[PDB]
């Protein structure tokens, strides 16, 4: 099955051979999950034209402004190495399986945020399914989302700190789904951000 990608304002099917040729031509494939307006993904594409930068978000309309920009000629802000895909991470199409050298989840919200905080299987499986073995997962959550008014998707959950990553069982759920936690830290810029890094391996018990 072909991927559903933005070309400017319209959803299209990506030729499976063009997708394959694009991956092989790249020095690294970065999959940015929940890319939002995709401006961060576009910046990365522009700074590393040797990377294939794949932004994944179900809310595809929000990405269209960046897509229009990425599709212009090179001299006018074009980024042909940026591929934006309409999909939710938990139902990620087969053509995205095993592609990524690096998976980033930067300031998620909604299902993606609750999923990573709880370690929901469907979200963590989807994230794992897009990674090559050995790829890093890099998650950043701003801890100010836990100050009032707290958003609905994490209202009922205690604030995620290095200590609760452990005591809620989140490193164990990660391990059961093929993610080995390599590092967690809180970085004070000034909003404090929680960073979690894991590496794609075989599932454990
Ligand atoms: C504001 S954005 C973050 C933008 C970007 N990551 C950044 O640099 O700040 C949060 C995104 O996570 C996305 N999201 C929520 N649930 C998701 C899911 N299940 N799969 C993929 N993305 C999802 C939302 O649609 C939203 O666009």
CB half-sphere exposure, 118, CA atoms < 13 A: 16
Q: Do the bridges between strand 179-187 and strand 193-200 make them parallel or antiparallel, or are there none, so unpaired?
A: antiparallel
Phi and psi of 45, rounded to 5°? -60, -45
Please give the distance, rounded to the nearest whole angstrom, from the Cα atom of residue 110 to the centre of ligand 1.
Answer: 7
* C-alpha 56 – ligand 1 centre gap (Å): 8
Distance of CA 58 to the CA centre of its chain: 12
CA of 63 to the centre of ligand 1 (A): 11
What is the rounded CA–CA span in Å between residue 58 and residue 80?
21
**Residue of 145, 154, 136, 25 lying closest to 80 (CA atoms):** 25
Cα 77 to ligand 1 centre (Å): 23
3-state secondary structure of 21: helix
Is 112 annotated as ligand-binding? yes
Q: Which of 69, 29, 67, 21 is nearest to 48 (CA)?
A: 29
- At 91, list the tokens: 């139902």
57 is in an annotated binding site: yes
Task: Tell me: is residue 40 an annotated ligand-binding position.
Answer: yes
d(CA 195, CA 111): 18
User: Sign of the C-alpha dihedral, residues 163, 164, 168, 173?
Assistant: negative
Contact 92, 124 (CB under 8 A): no
Q: Which two tokens stand for residue 176?
A: 């059961």
**Helical packing angle, 121-130 and 110-118, nearest 10°:** 100
| Data resolution in angstroms | 2.1
Phi, psi of 19 (to 5 degrees): -60, -45
Read off the tokens for 31: 């999959």
Q: Within 6 Å (CB) of ligand 1, which residues are found?
A: 33-36, 40, 56-59, 88-90, 106-112
For the chain, domain boundaries: 1-205
Helix (H) or strand (E) holding 130: helix 121-130
Which backbone phi and psi does 20 adopt, to 5 degrees? -65, -45
Residue whose Cα lies nearest atom 24 of ligand 1: it is 34
The CA distance from 173 to 192, in Å, is 25
User: Alpha-carbon torsion 191, 200, 38, 11, what sign?
Assistant: negative
Of 50, 36, 37, the residue nearest 79 (C-alpha): 50
Task: Say how far residue 116 (Cα) sits from the centre of its chain.
Answer: 11
Which atom of ligand 1 lies at the shortest distance from residue 106's CA?
6
Atom 3 of ligand 1, residue of closest alpha carbon: 36
Any idea which fold 1-205 has? Rossmann fold (3.40.50)
* 34: exposed, middle or buried (Cβ count in 10 Å: 0-12, 13-18, 19+): buried
Calpha distance 81→23 (Å, rounded): 10
Exposure pattern of 36-51 as b/e (b: 16+ CB <10 Å)? bebebbbebbbeeeeb
Strands 179-187 and 82-86 turn out to be: unpaired
Q: Which two tokens stand for residue 76?
A: 């006018």
Q: Two tokens at 73?
A: 């000629």
């Amino acid at each position: 099955t072909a991927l559903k990608v933005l070309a400017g304002k319209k959803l299209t099917d990506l030729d499976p051979d063009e997708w394959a040729k694009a991956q092989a031509s790249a020095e690294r494939i970065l999959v940015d999950v929940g890319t939002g307006d995709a401006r961060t993904a576009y910046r990365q594409a522009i700074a590393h034209p040797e990377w294939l930068v794949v932004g994944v978000d179900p809310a595809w309309q929000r990405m269209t402004e960046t897509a229009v920009r990425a599709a212009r000629k090179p001299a006018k802000g074009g980024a042909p190495n940026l591929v934006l895909v309409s999909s939710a991470i938990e139902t990620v199409p087969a053509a995205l399986h095993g592609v990524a050298d690096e998976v980033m989840v930067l300031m998620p919200w909604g299902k993606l945020l609750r999923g990573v905080v709880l370690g929901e299987a469907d979200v963590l499986s989807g994230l794992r399914a897009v990674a090559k073995p050995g790829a890093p997962l890099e998650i950043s959550i701003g801890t100010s989302i836990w100050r009032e008014p707290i958003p609905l998707e994490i209202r009922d959950l205690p604030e995620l700190t290095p200590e609760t990553v452990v005591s809620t069982g989140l490193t164990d759920r990660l391990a059961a789904l093929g993610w080995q936690v390599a590092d967690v830290r809180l970085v004070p810029h000034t909003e404090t951000v929680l960073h979690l890094r894991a590496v794609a391996v075989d599932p454990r018990d």
